[PDB]
From TrEMBL, chain A:
Role description: S1 region attaches the virion to the cell membrane by interacting with the host receptor, initiating the infection. Binding to the receptor probably induces conformational changes in the S glycoprotein unmasking the fusion peptide of S2 region and activating membranes fusion. S2 region belongs to the class I viral fusion protein. Under the current model, the protein has at least 3 conformational states: pre-fusion native state, pre-hairpin intermediate state, and post-fusion hairpin state.
Glycosylated residues (UniProt): 6
Source organism, top-level taxon: Viruses
Quaternary structure note: Homotrimer. During virus morphogenesis, found in a complex with M and HE proteins. Interacts with host receptor.
Residues of the full protein shown: 662 to 710 of 1386
Family stated for the protein in its record: Belongs to the alphacoronaviruses spike protein family.
Naturally occurring in which organism (per UniProt): Porcine epidemic diarrhea virus (PEDV)
Domain notes: The KxHxx motif seems to function as an ER retrieval signal.
Protein name: Spike glycoprotein
Compartments where found: Virion membrane; Host endoplasmic reticulum-Golgi intermediate compartment membrane
């Protein structure tokens, strides 16, 4: 999921964590940064009886 | 009084800043003075600026092919051959200061704004009918409120150049001193920019020479990748050829002029910086980058590698020299320090970044 | 980060580069690699728990 | 394996599960129809 985000990273064109996974990228023509998130997130189901 | 004069340097109210360059020396502090209050027609040479009715500025050989200046109260910048022959308003408060400074083919004027002009000249000779300045001076502004009030200016020695947060005193071994802010010293990458972490990377952080150039002044200079760069070293100089040179500025308007950055290859080919979207005219056109709205750092290194804001936009053949043409600043917030140029050599350094900027380094 | 002798560490990248048959062989290299890295993490936590 | 409880049972291989916490994936969109996004640097 690509969501426009409200930070203002000045350096680079796209950003990755220390593990090399894409975190955000910058629209160069406008300077706006968009964060990239997984489509689904992990959960824990509580299974009793 | 200099309250109005320094308010022309548009600065935020609660900010304390450092002024550098050919400013008014002052009438009472130091040696300085030389305020020619009377029409004595003083005659001095080697002058690089005047402050304040007749003014005549000319080359020392008094070349008829060189343009001389004559201000009388009308202004004529003329050879026998006239470029400007007109009349200019000359009304000011008695405490207002108007000055002109010439250096490196550049002229700066203080007529209600910090006007900047490019003009190839040699203007040490001058006659007049109120003081001279030959060497750069330095001030501090303890500004506390907008306008004239709260500026609280004072003069100071050269040590104040270390007060500005964007310049540093280079250690004798070439290391950047600890505690530097690295405000716009982006780590260099051809790829994704690390957000938060630590990397041991080969980066040009072994600085040999740092030029703290006042914001209001541009720079026309020739740098070579085989000789030590010229200019006044801010700290301990290192007599080493630059593997990279790093330009740290404030606003993008410095570079927008055509031919601002001219890169000379070992083949002798010239790459001229052009914007309209920035290309490198080859004398064909090579696309550099869609220039970001805020250019803060341009680092150019031999091995044919140019970076804007710490990104690998373009790679070229092995360079040997660079010529600049930087064009001052926007005259809307200047001299809150200096815009700098650092000659650097590559080094393996441990770099910690949070956000996207360096925060501490270890060679 | 580690591409366990596969084409790349990005699994969608593998499926774009390779055909479905050979991609299955390539992605199985990193599935084995990540599973062994996941088992190593578990084995050392159970040691901490003991 | 349609019920989320049954989906959890089929996530493991067992008809009954002990009481506990079992990892789970958030129910993604049933219809994929995923739009294609492509971003690269401008070229000349
Ligand atoms: C974005 O992409 C661009 C382009 O791809 C990258 O640009 C690269 O930048 C690196 C530096 O960060 C360049 O590496 C440098 O290459 C120099 C080339 O030298 C040539 O002549 C020497 C003669 O000795 C040859 O050895 C070289 O060939 C290779 O040799 C060995 C063989 O494995 C390699 O290990 C070398 O790296 C060379 O690639 C070249 O033909 C090279 O001289 C230079 O080496 C200095 O630094 C290393 C440490 O990395 C020292 O060990 C070494 O001793 C050198 O330091 C000495 O330098 C001079 C040499 O005379 C001395 O006078 C000094 O006193 C000092 O002791 C270095 O390896 C690379 O070439 C360049 N790529 C291209 C294509 O141009 C960007 O990096 C990339 N962005 C980022 C962020 O990485
Ligand atoms: C730079 O400016 C700040 C802001 O204060 C402004 O400048 C001063 C020189 C005065 O003209 C102020 O009227 C003006 O608003 C200075 O901070 C202030 O400095 C003054 C004295 O220099 C302080 O007054 C004294 O401070 C001492 C220690 O703090 C007290 O013990 C005294 O009782 C007396 O209050 C004042 O507190 C201080 N802060 C404020 C909010 O005014 C600053 O000194 C000045 N110089 C530098 C180098 O920063
Ligand atoms: C990244 O940022 C750039 C810069 O804002 C975005 O480009 C913008 O795209 C929109 C939609 O194409 C342009 O809107 C214009 O609307 C008029 C109205 O009809 C139309 O005639 C134009 O042809 C255009 O569609 C907008 O002008 C344009 N901005 C520019 C050119 O500066 C871009 O969409 C962003 N996203 C990317 C590149 O993924
Ligand atoms: C370094 O930068 C300066 C400043 O841009 C360069 O001077 C500029 O040179 C151009 C080329 O001729 C001038 O354009 C001309 O302007 C006149 C108006 O005076 C116009 O009539 C011509 O048609 C042409 O457009 C430009 O004005 C001039 N800049 C200034 C402030 O006068 C200089 O050439 C550069 N040096 C190098 C070595 O690149
Ligand atoms: C050059 O550096 C200066 C600071 O070192 C910056 O430009 C100036 O930044 C100040 C601080 O924002 C601006 O002043 C104030 O801006 C706020 C914004 O909300 C406004 O509310 C205030 O009334 C006041 O204007 C100042 O305008 C600005 N100067 C400009 C835009 O010319 C900036 O880092 C660099 N300037 C540029 C143009 O990049
Ligand atoms: C490429 O640029 C170089 C500048 O480094 C040019 O060489 C100089 O051109 C000036 C022009 O006024 C001469 O005064 C110098 O004598 C030349 N040599 C040097 C060493 O500076 C060169 O002519 C340019 N070539 C092209 C094709 O543009
Ligand atoms: C390039 O430089 C070579 C080495 O000489 C020195 O190089 C650097 C380290 C500086 O100290 C410089 O002042 C010295 O000259 C020379 O052998 C070579 O001739 C030079 N070539 C050119 C074209 O200048």
């Amino acid at each position: 999921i690509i969501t426009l985000t409200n930070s203002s990273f000045l350096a680079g064109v796209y950003y990755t964590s220390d593990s090399g996974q894409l975190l955000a990228f910058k629209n160069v023509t406008s300077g706006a940064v968009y964060s990239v998130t997984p489509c689904s997130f992990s959960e824990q189901a509580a299974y009793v009886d | 009084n200099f309250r109005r004069f320094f308010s022309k340097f548009n600065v935020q109210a609660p900010a304390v800043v450092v002024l550098g360059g050919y400013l008014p020396i002052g009438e009472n502090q130091g040696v300085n003075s030389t305020w020619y209050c009377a029409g004595q027609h003083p005659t001095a040479s080697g002058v690089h600026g005047i402050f304040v009715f007749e003014i005549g500025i000319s080359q020392e050989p008094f070349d008829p092919s060189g343009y001389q200046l004559y201000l009388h109260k009308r202004l004529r910048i003329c050879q026998r051959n006239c470029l400007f022959n007109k009349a200019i308003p000359a009304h000011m408060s008695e405490h207002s200061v108007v000055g002109i400074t010439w250096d490196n083919d550049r002229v700066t004027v203080f007529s209600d704004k910090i006007y900047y002009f490019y003009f190839k000249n040699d203007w040490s000779r001058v006659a007049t009918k109120m003081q001279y300045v030959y060497e750069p001076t330095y001030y501090m502004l303890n500004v506390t409120s907008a306008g004239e009030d709260g500026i609280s200016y004072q003069p100071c020695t050269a040590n104040c150049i270390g007060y500005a947060a964007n310049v540093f005193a280079t250690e004798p071994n070439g290391h950047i001193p600890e505690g530097f802010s690295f405000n716009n010293w982006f780590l260099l990458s051809n790829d994704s920019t690390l957000v938060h972490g630590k990397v041991v990377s080969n980066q040009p952080l072994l600085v040999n020479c740092l030029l703290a150039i006042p914001k209001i002044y541009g720079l026309g200079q020739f740098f070579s990748f085989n000789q030590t760069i010229d200019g006044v070293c801010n700290g301990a100089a290192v007599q080493r050829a630059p593997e990279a040179l790093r330009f740290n500025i404030n606003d993008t308007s410095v570079i927008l002029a055509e031919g601002s950055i001219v890169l000379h290859t070992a083949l002798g080919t010239n790459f001229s910086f052009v914007c309209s979207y920035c290309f490198f005219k080859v004398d064909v056109y090579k696309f550099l980058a869609v220039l970001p709205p805020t250019v803060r750092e341009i680092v150019i290194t031999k091995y044919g590698d140019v970076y804007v804001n710490g990104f690998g936009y373009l790679h070229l053949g092995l360079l040997d020299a660079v010529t600049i043409n930087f064009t001052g600043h926007g005259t809307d917030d200047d001299v809150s320090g200096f815009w700098t140029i650092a000659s650097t050599n590559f080094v393996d350094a441990l770099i910690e970044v949070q956000g996207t900027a360096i925060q501490r380094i270890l060679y | 980060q580690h591409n366990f002798q596969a084409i790349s560490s990005s699994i969608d990248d593998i499926y774009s580069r390779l055909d479905p048959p050979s991609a299955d062989v390539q992605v199985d290299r990193l599935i084995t690699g990540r599973l062994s890295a996941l088992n190593a993490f578990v084995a050392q936590t159970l040691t901490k728990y003991t | 394996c349609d019920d989320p409880v049954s989906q959890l049972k089929c996530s493991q291989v067992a008809f009954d599960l002990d009481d506990g916490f079992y990892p789970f994936s958030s129910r993604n969109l049933l219809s994929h129809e995923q739009p294609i996004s492509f971003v690269t640097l401008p070229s000349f």
